[PDB]
Amino acid sequence: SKITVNPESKAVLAGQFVKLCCRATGHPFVQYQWFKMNKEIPNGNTSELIFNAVHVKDAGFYVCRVNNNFTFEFSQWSQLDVCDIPESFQRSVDGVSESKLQICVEPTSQKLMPGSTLVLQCVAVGSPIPHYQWFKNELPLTHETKKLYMVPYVDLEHQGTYWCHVYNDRDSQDSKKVEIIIDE
Amino acid sequence: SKITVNPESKAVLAGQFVKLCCRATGHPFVQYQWFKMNKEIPNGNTSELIFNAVHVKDAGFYVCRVNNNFTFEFSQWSQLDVCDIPESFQRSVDGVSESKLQICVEPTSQKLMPGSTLVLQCVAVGSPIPHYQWFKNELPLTHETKKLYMVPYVDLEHQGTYWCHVYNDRDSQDSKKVEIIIDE
Ligand SMILES: [Cl-]
Ligand SMILES: [Cl-]
């Protein structure tokens, strides 16, 4: 029959306790079957899909099929993103995944020389899944929408103040504004 | 602002004309930006994302972000599946993708010997995306939910009548019931 609760797309750290939920109107008098894409997850025949301690391997797209005698309904797709980061960044994050949007890894300030690789990282967790947008000197970096902002070979033109805008539709958080100096 | 039309997950053949749609309440007085996962699709700044002649490379997960001055809303994820099949199976399918659920590639009847590889194929197109479930002698084959049903090395026990149940939530279509003989 019809679905009351659809699963949320979310970003979590590896090792954390994570659930994905699907609840029908007929609950508990319906059948549930979870899928990671077209793979029928074995023993994922319950309302909520539980990863006791997520692994990066677990990241991907999930859907839940709910049936009731005659019908069949597929839930919305849920994207599970699993980030592997050192313990040193897991401050203010326990072994249970929480929905709150929060930056775990912040960008860094660097003095590089022309020809260096510039690597900028911003890792956040939250539900709904966080989105990224990198900025340089108050302007958004066209198409820079990942945790990583990388420049293979820097010119002097790459100098400036950088930050990442992390956001969903419940919250947003700008990362530290970092300074990238390019000289010799 | 709020979203009126969310994109549907769909399966299409390569070369076909395909659209993905997102429409907000504020239309046409809003901004649209499409994404293939976290990649900001360039020039996908319109209500509908158009693939004039899809390529397999195009398959994947898409979302549309709609903003209106203050707000931001992400649509539901859409799964685009692109199947590459010979022209000989494209009968009753033109160069424009249609929503109707229909089997293009059917399983085949075979007389194999113990140790053979048994390959069973069932390819369908439709919107919402079709789902598969293989059956043997009236019983569903536990966890066989892909276009392909493959057995690397057949025993005599693999003999029987097979078919694929293709389905979404608007329609379903059973494939030809095929006979698999295992002898010598
Ligand atoms: Cl959930
Ligand atoms: Cl659509």
Curated annotation (Swiss-Prot), chains A, B:
Subcellular location: Cytoplasm, Perinuclear region; Nucleus
Domain of life according to the entry: Eukaryota
Modification type Phosphoserine: residues: S9
Tissue-level expression: Highly expressed in peripheral blood mononuclear cells. Detected at lower levels in bone marrow, thymus and lymph node, and at very low levels in colon and lung.
Disulphide bonds in the chain: C21-C64, C122-C164
Site (Breakpoint for translocation to form BIRC2-MALT1): Q90, R91, D183, E184
Ig-like C2-type domain boundaries: 2-75, 86-179
Record: disease: Immunodeficiency 12: A primary immunodeficiency characterized by onset in infancy of recurrent bacterial and candidal infections resulting in bronchiectasis and growth delay. Manifestations include mastoiditis, aphthous ulcers, cheilitis, gingivitis, esophagitis, gastritis, duodenitis, and meningitis. Levels of absolute lymphocytes and serum immunoglobulins are normal, but specific antibody titers are low despite immunization, and T-cells show impaired proliferative responses to mitogens.
Subunit structure, as described in the record: Homooligomer; forms oligomers which bind to TRAF6. Forms a complex with CARD14 and MALT1; resulting in the formation of a CBM (CARD14-BCL10-MALT1) complex. Forms a complex with CARD11 and MALT1; resulting in the formation of a CBM (CARD11-BCL10-MALT1) complex. Forms a complex with CARD9 and MALT1; resulting in the formation of a CBM (CARD9-BCL10-MALT1) complex.
Family: Belongs to the peptidase C14B family.
Role this protein plays: Protease that enhances BCL10-induced activation: acts via formation of CBM complexes that channel adaptive and innate immune signaling downstream of CARD domain-containing proteins (CARD9, CARD11 and CARD14) to activate NF-kappa-B and MAP kinase p38 pathways which stimulate expression of genes encoding pro-inflammatory cytokines and chemokines. Mediates BCL10 cleavage: MALT1-dependent BCL10 cleavage plays an important role in T-cell antigen receptor-induced integrin adhesion. Involved in the induction of T helper 17 cells (Th17) differentiation.
Protein known as: Mucosa-associated lymphoid tissue lymphoma translocation protein 1
Provenance organism: Homo sapiens
Classification of source organism: Eukaryota, Metazoa, Chordata, Craniata, Vertebrata
Gene: MALT1
Residue numbers of the full-length protein present here: 128 to 321 of 824
